[PDB]
Write a protein that binds this ligand. Sequence first.
Ligand SMILES: *[C@@H]1O[C@H](CO)[C@@H](O[C@@H]2O[C@H](CO)[C@@H](O)[C@H](O)[C@H]2NC(C)=O)[C@H](O)[C@H]1NC(C)=O
Ligand SMILES: *[C@@H]1O[C@H](CO)[C@@H](O)[C@H](O)[C@H]1NC(C)=O
Ligand SMILES: *[C@@H]1O[C@H](CO)[C@@H](O)[C@H](O)[C@H]1NC(C)=O
Ligand SMILES: *[C@@H]1O[C@H](CO)[C@@H](O)[C@H](O)[C@H]1NC(C)=O
Ligand SMILES: *[C@@H]1O[C@H](CO)[C@@H](O)[C@H](O)[C@H]1NC(C)=O
Ligand SMILES: *[C@@H]1O[C@H](CO)[C@@H](O)[C@H](O)[C@H]1NC(C)=O
Lengths: 495, 497
Amino acid sequence: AELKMDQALLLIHNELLWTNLTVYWKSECCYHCLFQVLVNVPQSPKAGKPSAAAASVSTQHGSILQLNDTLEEKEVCRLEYRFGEFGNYSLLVKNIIACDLAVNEDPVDLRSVDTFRGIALILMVFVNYGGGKYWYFKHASWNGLTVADLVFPWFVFIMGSSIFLSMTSILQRGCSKFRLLGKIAWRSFLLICIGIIIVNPNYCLGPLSWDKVRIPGVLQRLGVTYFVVAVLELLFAKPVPSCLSLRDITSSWPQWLLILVLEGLWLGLTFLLPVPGCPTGYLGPGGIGDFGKYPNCTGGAAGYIDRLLLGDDHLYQHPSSAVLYHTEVAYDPEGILGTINSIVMAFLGVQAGKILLYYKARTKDILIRFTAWCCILGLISVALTKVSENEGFIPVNKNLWSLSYVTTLSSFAFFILLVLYPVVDVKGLWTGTPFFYPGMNSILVYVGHEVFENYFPFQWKLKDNQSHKEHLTQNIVATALWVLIAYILYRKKIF
Amino acid sequence: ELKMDQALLLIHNELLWTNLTVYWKSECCYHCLFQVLVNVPQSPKAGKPSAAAASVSTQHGSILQLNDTLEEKEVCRLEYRFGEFGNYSLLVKNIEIACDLAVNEDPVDSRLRSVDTFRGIALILMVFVNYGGGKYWYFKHASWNGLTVADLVFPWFVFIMGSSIFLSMTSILQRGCSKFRLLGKIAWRSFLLICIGIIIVNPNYCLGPLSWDKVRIPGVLQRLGVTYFVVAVLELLFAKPVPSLRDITSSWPQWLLILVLEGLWLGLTFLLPVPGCPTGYLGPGGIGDFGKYPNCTGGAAGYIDRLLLGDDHLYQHPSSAVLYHTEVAYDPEGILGTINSIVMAFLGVQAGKILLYYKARTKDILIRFTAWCCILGLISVALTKVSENEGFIPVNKNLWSLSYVTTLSSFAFFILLVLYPVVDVKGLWTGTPFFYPGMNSILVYVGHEVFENYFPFQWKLKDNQSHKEHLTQNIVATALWVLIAYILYRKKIFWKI
Ligand SMILES: *[C@@H]1O[C@H](CO)[C@@H](O[C@@H]2O[C@H](CO)[C@@H](O)[C@H](O)[C@H]2NC(C)=O)[C@H](O)[C@H]1NC(C)=O
Ligand SMILES: *[C@@H]1O[C@H](CO)[C@@H](O)[C@H](O)[C@H]1NC(C)=O
Ligand SMILES: *[C@@H]1O[C@H](CO)[C@@H](O)[C@H](O)[C@H]1NC(C)=O
Ligand SMILES: *[C@@H]1O[C@H](CO)[C@@H](O)[C@H](O)[C@H]1NC(C)=O
Ligand SMILES: *[C@@H]1O[C@H](CO)[C@@H](O)[C@H](O)[C@H]1NC(C)=O
Ligand SMILES: *[C@@H]1O[C@H](CO)[C@@H](O)[C@H](O)[C@H]1NC(C)=O
């Protein structure tokens, strides 16, 4: 009918005579949102003849219906409810002002690094196709840690580990450093150009033009972090040679000094840089967020730096907060300031690779180091976020690539590695059979699924687009087909 | 304000008590009904003639007819050919009555590796003409009949593909291999080509996700795969070891089969009755043939294709839509055209047989190619009577007519005759910029089909109505695809896609 995806009709009529009602809606998960107007409920023309109105409240998560009249601005009913999808809820307001919100119809219902990379790629492809249009399979509106926020950081962690592993293997093979540097620069340049040309633009609307080309993005950031980490490791590389040896940390001390100074630079630039027409050290979403007194401030210092450097037209025109906070500005999640945190996370992946490689002959030592790093990073994350998605010093935020976000995802990745390394490598109980096929063809699978996003085996016309089940089935089938394609490529040894 | 290849025609009518209407038909139409271009009202008074503006096409020729609106009497007519961006003004006044056309502003318009080189040239020409070729009239497909440069890209590809099947299969058989595995590989390759075509090439996904009710089944790659399968299976079933008319006495079975198929095609085209349509029809319908048969595109071939596949599963914008104003759907890569495509692929197999049987002696190869080209040219001249629209079977791309096959095969034989000594015997030119697509045919074709809209091959234009911009963009895209083919060749990547 007239109900879109995840909406519930709200038939509302007033059993009163001398007040004009305007229903005001505000989703619960928002931190500080101005109550947007929803409908206008007039007075009943005669006694016993209420005037009905139709509303479509978003039922993704919660709702706070606030009602105070236009004439007097005095409350009549403010109630918090959680509507269901495709429901039919009737709000009866009457004298005793009292409201009940009756319900008409019930709403409807080594090998470990490779396995981990395959898991991250499969989840990324799933959430990129839409993830069944579920609110927990899409990027969270500003602060939040939905499932789609857990894919890219793990991929960067895995790439850091693989960078260190391959660098050590090549240096042990005996190749010179200049050839390695040339190769690293070439791969980074290729990744950047691929991201700028093939992945980021959408060519169905029309041809690419400089005035409307999106420079930063996923693959550009991936290549830049690749280049930075690989060059740093190639510069400060030492031959690989326990009981509290602490060699893996003290040997790579220049890397740690550089990473710490980079993190300090990110913290200072975010929390101290004076943004014109915006409070210094802003972390909010702008738009209607923070009670709506900051209309154009999305991203704070990072957003301002990105807009100044690349222009407001070369960024993402539909940021992840544009669906909830109604931000009218453009903000790329893969901006310029977040590259520092991405580099830090890739270096944490390098650290995991160092732990894996140094103590190759003692599994107990590897597990102890992994769990110690996981505990330390988890403690840092808990201290920073104050175990809350809104409060705390630095909230976990994907768009800003917050330091708490990096530390939390590093904790999760270290725990995942602590689980995966024994079973897949040491015990060999389960080789990650359905997963590592993209683990060996990451970049090819990503580029292919971006190019072939719209083709028949991955997309087809559905009976009703306003249904979660059909979208979920289509996305699952597409991801399974990409797993099968990666398997076929692996069998033919096309790397 | 003006479109591309469209002059501006201003009519100044000094007549007093006669409404004036004009008509226009392209000089390239065989029999086209005139269409209303513009209506010029009578002048309210002497000295202030009524002026009306209209845009006239320019791609090729123009014939105008001036008729009275009420009395339906012809006043005057012209055969002037306009310019791309002109300002021609037409004045008609009573003197009998004569109309003079004036120009206000002048227009502004002024292994063997020989098979590999052939296939590379055909592929590059195909990629150029698919991107548009500058929107030129002779770089696009012919309207219904005739032979433009864009019509020669595909038949040469099918010819060389057939020759390559023969060469590769005879090499494999000579080296030693079972026939069952070969037939299985051929079937897999044909099925893969058909599926690739249907899923990737034919449908456009930007307008929306694929819907089964509007899926175009026939197309270039499905036809390629079907003829590949048929000709490869025939030549594999009848394959004798290599050892003077010794290249036909060893091939008479498949020759008889090809003659049977050609006879079947001729019978179906010229004899199969069609409901509400003249038997043995070839005209484009619409306004062609004086508009007596509106929905009769292709005739027998169109009717058979529509009956077997349905109107929804066809090419909705055929080549004749722009000129002959037809509403029905006709797929150029239909079902009856597959017989002639098979015949041309078999002719390519015959050319490969000629090239292989006399590999030692080059004089014999050259005389064989000369004889084949001359015989096919004579057959084409007899069939088409040397005219675009006359003759028994005019050269037709959409129908894949027999004259089309004979003419394009004679041209392919002559091109092979020129290329073979140059690339092999004398070694003057080694196909340096062309044979990399000759090695990566299918990969390059599918890549350019998928990446047609991407930036290096297509970007926003400064002036969308300039031929120069489109030509530069298409040439740059084709050069980039040559470069990509060369890079793939250097990295030893080859025909696996
Ligand atoms: C313009 O007028 C001329 C003459 O009146 C038309 O020529 C004849 O048209 C009738 C029917 O309209 C045909 O039966 C004749 O065969 C035509 N030729 C002759 C010599 O009589 C002409 O058709 C008119 N233009 C258009 C577009 O209809
Ligand atoms: C309520 O609204 C109606 C029209 O919507 C208006 O005529 C009436 O005056 C309003 N009542 C008050 C008290 O403003
Ligand atoms: C409801 O009343 C509060 C004050 O208690 C006010 O801030 C708010 O704007 C009112 N809602 C409206 C006017 O929609
Ligand atoms: C919701 O319930 C009311 C109660 O009768 C009904 O009239 C209305 O049609 C229902 N909504 C829809 C969309 O059917
Ligand atoms: C020419 O067309 C005009 C416009 O309708 C009309 O008034 C006039 O009568 C026409 N001329 C003749 C001779 O009918
Ligand atoms: C054609 O000439 C007329 C009068 O000379 C002028 O008004 C008109 O703009 C010209 N059109 C073009 C396309 O030059």
